[PDB]
Write an enzyme that holds these catalytic residues in place. Structure first.
Site, PDB file in Angstrom:
ATOM      1  N   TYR A  45       0.843  -1.182   0.000  1.00 55.48           N
ATOM      2  CA  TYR A  45       0.000   0.000   0.000  1.00 55.48           C
ATOM      3  C   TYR A  45       0.885   1.239   0.000  1.00 55.48           C
ATOM      4  CZ  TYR A  45       0.890   1.043   4.960  1.00 55.48           C
ATOM      5  OH  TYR A  45       1.515   1.339   6.121  1.00 55.48           O
ATOM      6  N   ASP A  56       2.658   7.404   3.656  1.00 56.79           N
ATOM      7  CA  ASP A  56       3.165   6.164   4.230  1.00 56.79           C
ATOM      8  C   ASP A  56       3.040   5.027   3.211  1.00 56.79           C
ATOM      9  OD1 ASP A  56       3.853   4.031   6.237  1.00 56.79           O
ATOM     10  OD2 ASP A  56       1.654   3.780   6.329  1.00 56.79           O
ATOM     11  N   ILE A  75      -8.186   0.081   9.988  1.00 63.30           N
ATOM     12  CA  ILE A  75      -9.362   0.935   9.908  1.00 63.30           C
ATOM     13  C   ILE A  75     -10.459   0.213   9.118  1.00 63.30           C
ATOM     14  CG2 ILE A  75      -7.987   3.003  10.224  1.00 63.30           C
ATOM     15  CD1 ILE A  75      -7.866   3.483   7.340  1.00 63.30           C
ATOM     16  N   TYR A 101      -9.922   7.419  11.161  1.00 60.30           N
ATOM     17  CA  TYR A 101      -9.483   7.655  12.534  1.00 60.30           C
ATOM     18  C   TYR A 101     -10.365   8.663  13.282  1.00 60.30           C
ATOM     19  CZ  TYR A 101      -5.405   4.818  11.365  1.00 60.30           C
ATOM     20  OH  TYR A 101      -4.595   3.796  10.949  1.00 60.30           O
ATOM     21  N   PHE A 118      -5.701   5.756  -0.233  1.00 57.58           N
ATOM     22  CA  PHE A 118      -4.804   4.618  -0.337  1.00 57.58           C
ATOM     23  C   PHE A 118      -4.845   4.060  -1.761  1.00 57.58           C
ATOM     24  CE2 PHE A 118      -5.728   4.429   4.248  1.00 57.58           C
ATOM     25  CZ  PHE A 118      -4.516   4.095   4.812  1.00 57.58           C
TER      26      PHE A 118
END
Ligand SMILES: COc1cc([C@@H](C(=O)N2CCCC[C@H]2C(=O)OCc2scnc2C)C2CCCCC2)cc(OC)c1OC
Length: 128
Positions: A45, A56, A75, A101, A118
């Protein structure tokens, strides 16, 4: 950019139909089979805040990210989204903070009420 494309053209894979999770398939996978709850999943990812400085990636640490699907170990958007994917699929997910989140966020990396994006590659899934 990619988030934009998902806003405009992405599909709402949420149950409530609240546009909390929008998905485009960017590369089709192999077969018709997608993972069951409790399956061990293997992904690469890249993630980012839809507009922000935090970014990230599993590719960076060159280890695949591995999690047990559907157990809330990631998540909620990932449990929803990865379950719709086939082996070898790459997908783009745009995620509202309710499936991510929330208002509480998660410093240092995630602010409050953050929308996340993502790119996810589904590498493999194995039975528990
Ligand atoms: C909440 O804190 C984190 C969140 C993530 C990333 C993230 O949101 N991820 C990581 C890959 C699975 C989806 C989602 C997540 O559930 O991450 C938290 C979990 S749950 C089990 N391991 C992790 C890192 C975000 C980092 C900033 C750009 C948007 C993606 C990575 C993180 O480091 C790997 C992290 O802190 C450890």
């Amino acid at each position: 950019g990619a988030p934009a494309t998902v806003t405009e053209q992405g599909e709402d894979i949420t149950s409530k139909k609240d546009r909390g999770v929008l998905k485009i398939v960017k590369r089709v996978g192999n077969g018709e089979e997608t993972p069951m709850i409790g399956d061990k999943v293997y992904v690469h990812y890249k993630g980012k805040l839809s507009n922000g400085k935090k970014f990230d990636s599993s590719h960076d640490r060159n280890e695949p990210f591995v999690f047990s699907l559907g157990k809330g170990q990631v998540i909620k958007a990932w449990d929803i989204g990865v379950a719709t994917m086939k082996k070898g699929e790459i997908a783009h997910l745009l995620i509202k903070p309710e499936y991510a989140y929330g208002s509480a966020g998660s410093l240092p990396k995630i602010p409050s009420n953050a929308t996340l994006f993502f790119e996810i590659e589904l590498l493999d899934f194995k039975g528990e």
